Amino acid sequence: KTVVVTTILESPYVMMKKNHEMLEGNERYEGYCVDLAAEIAKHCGFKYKLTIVGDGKYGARDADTKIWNGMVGELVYGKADIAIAPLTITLVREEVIDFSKPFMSLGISIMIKKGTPIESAEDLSKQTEIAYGTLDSGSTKEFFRRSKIAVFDKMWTYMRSAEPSVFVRTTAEGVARVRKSKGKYAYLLESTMNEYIEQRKPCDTMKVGGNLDSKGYGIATPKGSSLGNAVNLAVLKLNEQGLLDKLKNKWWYDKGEC
Ligand SMILES: N[C@@H](CCC(=O)O)C(=O)O
Ligand SMILES: [Zn+2]
């Protein structure tokens, strides 16, 4: 009856509300995905419960164990009915879960501490002074692991063998490493998160160069779910009405601190 929604604490998508300890259920959270969940639910005609993914991950299949972790895993093993998060539509995921058409368009980009002598991915690859990494488990990490393009293969080769590790557990961890490294650490993350951080105090980071690829985030459901068709139509209806753009403006730029 009540649709269990799996999501992830990733700003500005889902964040803990100021006085959440005094609130209950869905009212404990706020963010772009919280506003979107409320809308997809209204339009699809269902009651839901927001749940933060237990392992705090997006979703990857473990090569040795074959188990799916993160939000994807919660959908695959039936722990959740739908995932409303900045979850990238990829081929390996679409083979096990269903995705609506994209609700947000993005691409991998570079986050530097202001003043870092880096203008592109080619620049990162051609040097060693400045370290660079990605989110440990996710679509960005896989983009480099599977890239046939020379510049990205070179970047991956360095990243996988770099010590100490250049990969981080969460986006926030990557952002702090950038901020605390005096320009000695650049971070590869999706343009959406980069643009969000670029508008947050201490206003010391910046997105550089173009996007490395083009892709989208989709609302995910288990393969052959009943909700699939309706949520896809809701995403299309809401994009066409201007809500998705309105929501990105609200959480990224309207509340900008820089
Ligand atoms: N949106 C990504 C996580 C962030 C990243 O990989 O940079 C995913 O669904 O895996
Ligand atoms: Zn509406």
Swiss-Prot record:
Upregulating conditions: Down-regulated in the pyramidal cell layer of CA1 in the hippocampus by global ischemia.
Q: Could you state what the record's PTM comment says about this protein?
A: Palmitoylated. Depalmitoylated upon L-glutamate stimulation. Ubiquitinated by RNF167, leading to its degradation.
**Disulfide bridge positions per record:** 203-258
Ranges of the Extracellular topological domain: 117-258
For the site labelled Interaction with the cone snail toxin Con-ikot-ikot, the residues are 61, 145, 237
- Positions that bind L-glutamate: 86, 88, 93, 139-140, 190
The UniProt family comment states: Belongs to the glutamate-gated ion channel (TC 1.A.10.1) family. GRIA2 subfamily.
Function, in words? Ionotropic glutamate receptor that functions as a ligand-gated cation channel, gated by L-glutamate and glutamatergic agonists such as alpha-amino-3-hydroxy-5-methyl-4-isoxazolepropionic acid (AMPA), quisqualic acid, and kainic acid. L-glutamate acts as an excitatory neurotransmitter at many synapses in the central nervous system and plays an important role in fast excitatory synaptic transmission.
Q: How does it assemble?
A: Homotetramer or heterotetramer of pore-forming glutamate receptor subunits. Tetramers may be formed by the dimerization of dimers. May interact with MPP4. Forms a ternary complex with GRIP1 and CSPG4. Interacts with ATAD1 in an ATP-dependent manner. ATAD1-catalyzed ATP hydrolysis disrupts binding to ATAD1 and to GRIP1 and leads to AMPAR complex disassembly. Interacts with GRIP2. Interacts with GRIP1. Interacts with NSF via its C-terminus. Interacts with CACNG2, PICK1 and GRIP2. Interacts with GRIA1 and SYNDIG1. Part of a complex containing GRIA2, NSF and NAPA and/or NAPB.
Q: What else is known?
A: The postsynaptic actions of L-glutamate are mediated by a variety of receptors that are named according to their selective agonists. This receptor binds AMPA (quisqualate) > L-glutamate > kainate.
Q: What is this protein called?
A: Glutamate receptor 2
| Native organism | Rattus norvegicus (Rat)
**Full-sequence portion shown in this chain:** 414 to 794 of 883
